[PDB]
Amino acid sequence: PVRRSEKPNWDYHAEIQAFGHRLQENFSLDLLKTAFVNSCYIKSEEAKRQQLGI
């Protein structure tokens, strides 16, 4: 099994917007996006960036 974001037909920004409307909530997109960002993800991204120097 893999993440849905990796599969075809995925647009993060559209998926985030549907998340709020589906729940009938007026989420602040900037705040809602931050909610999904986990500390572990930030660390793993940095390691990937460093080894693959850009």
Partner 1 sequence: ILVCPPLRSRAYTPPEDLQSRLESYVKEVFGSSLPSNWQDISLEDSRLKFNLLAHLADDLGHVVPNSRLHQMCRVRDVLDFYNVPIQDRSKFDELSASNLPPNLKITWSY
Partner 2 sequence: TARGTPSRFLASVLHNGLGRYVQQLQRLSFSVSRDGASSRGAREFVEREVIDFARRNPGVVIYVNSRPCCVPRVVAEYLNGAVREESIHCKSVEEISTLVQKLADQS
Query: Binding of partner 2 at residue 18 (CB under 8 A)?
Result: yes
Largest CA distance in the chain: 43
Query: Binding of partner 2 at residue 2 (CB under 8 A)?
Result: no
3-class secondary-structure state, position 23? coil
The answer to whether 45 and 33 are in contact (CB under 8 A) is no
Nearer to partner 1, 9 or 38 (CB): 9
Query: Binding of partner 1 at residue 46 (CB under 8 A)?
Result: no
Structure tokens at 3: 């993440």
Nearer to partner 2, 15 or 45 (CB): 15
Query: Binding of partner 1 at residue 12 (CB under 8 A)?
Result: no
